[PDB]
């Protein structure tokens, strides 16, 4: 599998070198020969498994395997600044928002989980809650789900990460196996996971996986222009927070 991602702007150095550390744990990056030259630098990003990647120039990656792909993504969330968005929307919209308002909404959403989950997650959830603030009706709400789904996905890692701290840094499916109702932990991990932790994980994963599947499965031969209804989105955003907030409480 391969990928290419082209990022406009970026780093201005700060972000890039900034970016690299995180990848520091743990992949190997080395400069490489730059040929035709709108590009200041070219790098190769490496792994024990056999990954490869690229650069750079307002930056581009092409890579052999997905894994660096994830890391680059998590970071960009990391860049993510809440205050930051706010100016944009109003500029997008008439509406003026006290950002500090949302947390009220957000805190309200995760009464027992607010301070027990990674900031990264909050940011995604907070993004999803924008919808409640804006009166204007809209064509598509899918984006709001996307944030929701992202949060829950992270939430799963957060648990996974603590419960099993693995060099491998693999993928969610890996931990999980299929049963006709709620999903279950792969047998291989049942030794280690094997909890009420498992139940929380499975409850969450199952919600994510199907919704992800519902949203992104495409029929071959089709050119979808469909849109996601508001209630349609609310159920999801709301449902997720409950799982997250609920999970934390249940796993005191």
């Amino acid at each position: 599998k391969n990928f290419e991602y082209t990022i406009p702007k970026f780093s201005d150095d700060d972000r890039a070198n900034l970016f690299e550390f995180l990848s520091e744990e743990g992949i190997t990056i080395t400069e490489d020969n730059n040929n035709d030259p709108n590009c200041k630098h070219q790098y190769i990003m490496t792994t024990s498994n056999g990954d490869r990647v690229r650069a750079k120039i307002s930056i581009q990656f092409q890579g052999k395997y997905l894994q660096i792909a994830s890391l680059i993504n998590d970071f960009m969330c990391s860049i993510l600044n809440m205050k930051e968005i706010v100016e944009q929307k109003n500029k997008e919209f008439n509406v003026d928002i006290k950002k500090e308002t949302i947390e009220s909404e957000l805190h309200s959403k995760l009464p027992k989980s607010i301070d027990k989950i990674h900031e990264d997650i909050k940011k995604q959830l907070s993004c999803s809650l924008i919808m409640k603030k804006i009166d204007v009706e809209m064509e598509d709400y899918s984006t709001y789900c996307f944030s929701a789904l992202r949060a829950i996905e992270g939430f799963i890692y957060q648990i996974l990460n603590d419960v099993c701290n693995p060099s491998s840094s693999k993928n969610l499916g890996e931990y999980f196996t299929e049963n006709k109702p709620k999903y279950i932990i792969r047998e291989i991990h049942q030794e280690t996971i094997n909890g009420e932790i498992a139940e929380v994980l499975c409850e969450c994963y199952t919600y994510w996986h199907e919704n992800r599947h519902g949203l992104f499965h495409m029929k071959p031969g089709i050119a979808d222009t469909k849109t996601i209804n508001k209630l349609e989105s609310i159920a999801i955003i709301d449902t997720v927070c409950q799982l997250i907030d609920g999970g934390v409480a249940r796993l005191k």
Binding site: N2, Y5, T143, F146, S147, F216, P220, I222, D224, T225
Partner: protein, 57 residues
Amino acid sequence: LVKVVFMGWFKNESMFTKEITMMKDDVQWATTQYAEVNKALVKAFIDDKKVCEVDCR
């Protein structure tokens, strides 16, 4: 918040397409999902230009 068109190719060379309006920063992730779910190669275009690509066949 922009309109994006996703284009996908299955292993069998069939094709799929989607138009969504969504916040820009989610596009790659989104692109990633389409490919991972359908085992497909997906390219994402904004304003007629290709900003992201992922392949999972």
